[PDB]
Design an enzyme around this catalytic site. Structure first.
Site, short mmCIF file in Angstrom:
data_model
loop_
_atom_site.label_atom_id
_atom_site.label_comp_id
_atom_site.label_asym_id
_atom_site.label_seq_id
_atom_site.Cartn_x
_atom_site.Cartn_y
_atom_site.Cartn_z
N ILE A 199 49.12 -72.32 -4.95
CA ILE A 199 49.31 -72.22 -3.50
C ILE A 199 47.96 -72.31 -2.78
O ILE A 199 47.87 -72.84 -1.67
CB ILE A 199 50.03 -70.84 -3.16
CG1 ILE A 199 51.52 -71.03 -2.99
CG2 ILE A 199 49.46 -70.15 -1.93
CD1 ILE A 199 52.26 -69.71 -2.98
N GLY A 200 46.93 -71.75 -3.40
CA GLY A 200 45.61 -71.70 -2.80
C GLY A 200 44.66 -70.66 -3.38
O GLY A 200 44.89 -70.11 -4.45
N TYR A 246 39.84 -63.06 -2.38
CA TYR A 246 39.80 -62.12 -3.49
C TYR A 246 40.18 -62.77 -4.83
O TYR A 246 39.77 -62.30 -5.90
CB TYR A 246 40.76 -60.95 -3.24
CG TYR A 246 40.80 -60.42 -1.82
CD1 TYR A 246 40.28 -59.17 -1.51
CD2 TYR A 246 41.40 -61.16 -0.80
CE1 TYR A 246 40.33 -58.67 -0.21
CE2 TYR A 246 41.45 -60.67 0.51
CZ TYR A 246 40.91 -59.43 0.79
OH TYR A 246 40.95 -58.94 2.08
N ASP A 296 41.04 -59.77 8.98
CA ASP A 296 40.72 -61.17 8.71
C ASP A 296 41.81 -62.14 9.08
O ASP A 296 42.19 -63.01 8.31
CB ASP A 296 40.35 -61.37 7.24
CG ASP A 296 39.73 -62.71 7.01
OD1 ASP A 296 39.03 -63.19 7.93
OD2 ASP A 296 39.95 -63.39 5.99
C1 LIG Z 1 45.88 -68.93 -0.69
C2 LIG Z 1 46.76 -67.75 -0.20
C3 LIG Z 1 47.28 -67.70 1.29
C4 LIG Z 1 47.49 -66.22 1.81
O1 LIG Z 1 47.73 -66.04 3.21
N1 LIG Z 1 48.47 -68.63 1.36
C5 LIG Z 1 49.71 -68.31 1.19
N2 LIG Z 1 50.68 -69.23 1.44
C6 LIG Z 1 52.05 -69.00 1.34
N3 LIG Z 1 52.82 -69.91 1.63
C7 LIG Z 1 52.59 -71.10 2.15
C8 LIG Z 1 52.44 -72.31 1.30
C9 LIG Z 1 53.57 -73.03 0.84
C10 LIG Z 1 53.38 -74.17 0.00
C11 LIG Z 1 52.06 -74.56 -0.38
C12 LIG Z 1 50.93 -73.82 0.09
C13 LIG Z 1 51.12 -72.68 0.93
O2 LIG Z 1 50.06 -71.93 1.39
C14 LIG Z 1 52.46 -67.73 0.91
N4 LIG Z 1 53.64 -67.11 0.69
C15 LIG Z 1 53.40 -65.88 0.33
N5 LIG Z 1 52.04 -65.60 0.27
C16 LIG Z 1 51.35 -64.31 -0.09
C17 LIG Z 1 50.19 -64.35 -1.12
C18 LIG Z 1 50.83 -63.68 1.19
C19 LIG Z 1 51.42 -66.77 0.63
N6 LIG Z 1 50.08 -67.07 0.78
#
Ligand SMILES: CC[C@H](CO)Nc1nc(NCc2ccccc2O)c2ncn(C(C)C)c2n1
Length: 294
Positions: A10-11, A15, A123
């Protein structure tokens, strides 16, 4: 944990790394944040456990916390898109005002809740604002910064952006307040409206100077106690406040009024989330659905 299969990266937060993953028992799809190693401070474990209890429709649910081989996995509910990507996909049309208004209102509800429990985000940024197909938006990474005090680099040392940082943090205030989140949200509001970041600083002094160029260099008239701040310098250049209809056109007078109260220099004059919910800008607030492409 062996209970999860990774689906895709996802990314990469501040942390650690975030994966989309499927639970092998229940079959739920979750987001897994993996953090790395000293034995993991017991303090951080206590503090993160209390975030499990901070449940609100506009906050990304922390499902579970797994401390294993003295390593830390945070299991969150999964959302399909973040606001940064949604902004980038709406770049040529812009987000419709009713949807901007709805998202802003929902995040203020989120913040009013966290703040009434004295939990700060610290943040806030478009990449940690997550959205679903039903018109919801949710705050993600809430309260994690306080767990272990965030640095300016990630795990492969990618850059943490300064663009949404409140001036009191930049001037070295150690004991900053819930007002820092309101500042960030104001910055995001302006960016939804204009389709450009408000203050895209590439260092702390460039971030400060971009704020000063727009809002005027702060002094004791607008911000009592500012000149006594740890990183305040008498030698800062002296920029006059720009007229504010210049900053977020074509936003109406109500929106500009709210934004201006969100971006007050003095953290004690800056509007609270609860007060902002009562602002006239939200008199006609609704809840549209975005068309999301997943
Ligand atoms: C790299 C982490 C960040 C946290 O805000 N992105 C992210 N995207 C999320 N979803 C969006 C997404 C969907 C598909 C591809 C990438 C993406 O960021 C997500 N869902 C739950 N979390 C938790 C860890 C909060 C998420 N975190």
């Amino acid at each position: 944990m062996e209970n999860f299969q990774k689906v895709e990266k996802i990314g990469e937060g501040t942390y650690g790394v975030v994966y989309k993953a499927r639970n092998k028992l229940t079959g739920e799809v979750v987001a897994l944040k993996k953090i790395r190693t000293e034995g993991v401070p017991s303090t951080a474990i206590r503090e993160i456990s209390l975030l499990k209890e901070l449940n609100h429709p506009n906050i990304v649910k922390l499902l579970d916390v797994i401390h294993t081989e003295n390593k830390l996995y945070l299991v969150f509910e999964f959302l399909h898109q973040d606001l940064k990507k949604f902004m980038d996909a709406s770049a040529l049309t812009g987000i419709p005002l009713p949807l901007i208004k709805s998202y802003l209102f929902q995040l203020l509800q989120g913040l009013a809740f966290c703040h009434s429990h004295r939990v700060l985000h610290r943040d806030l940024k478009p990449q940690n604002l997550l959205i679903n197909t039903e018109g919801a938006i949710k705050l993600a990474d809430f309260g994690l910064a306080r767990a272990f005090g965030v640095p300016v680099r990630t795990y492969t040392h990618e850059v943490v952006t300064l663009w949404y940082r409140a001036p009191e943090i930049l001037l070295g205030c150690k004991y900053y307040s819930t007002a820092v989140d309101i500042w960030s949200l104001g910055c995001i509001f302006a960016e939804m409206v204009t389709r450009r970041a408000l203050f895209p600083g590439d260092s702390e002094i460039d971030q400060l100077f971009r704020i000063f160029r727009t809002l005027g260099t702060p002094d004791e008239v607008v911000w009592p106690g500012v000149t006594s701040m740890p990183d305040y310098k008498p030698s800062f250049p002296k920029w006059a406040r720009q007229d504010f209809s210049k900053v977020v056109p074509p936003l109406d007078e109500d929106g500009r009024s709210l934004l201006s109260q969100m971006l007050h220099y003095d953290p004690n004059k800056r509007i609270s989330a609860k007060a902002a919910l009562a602002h006239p800008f939200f008199q006609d607030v609704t809840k549209p659905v975005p068309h999301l492409r997943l």
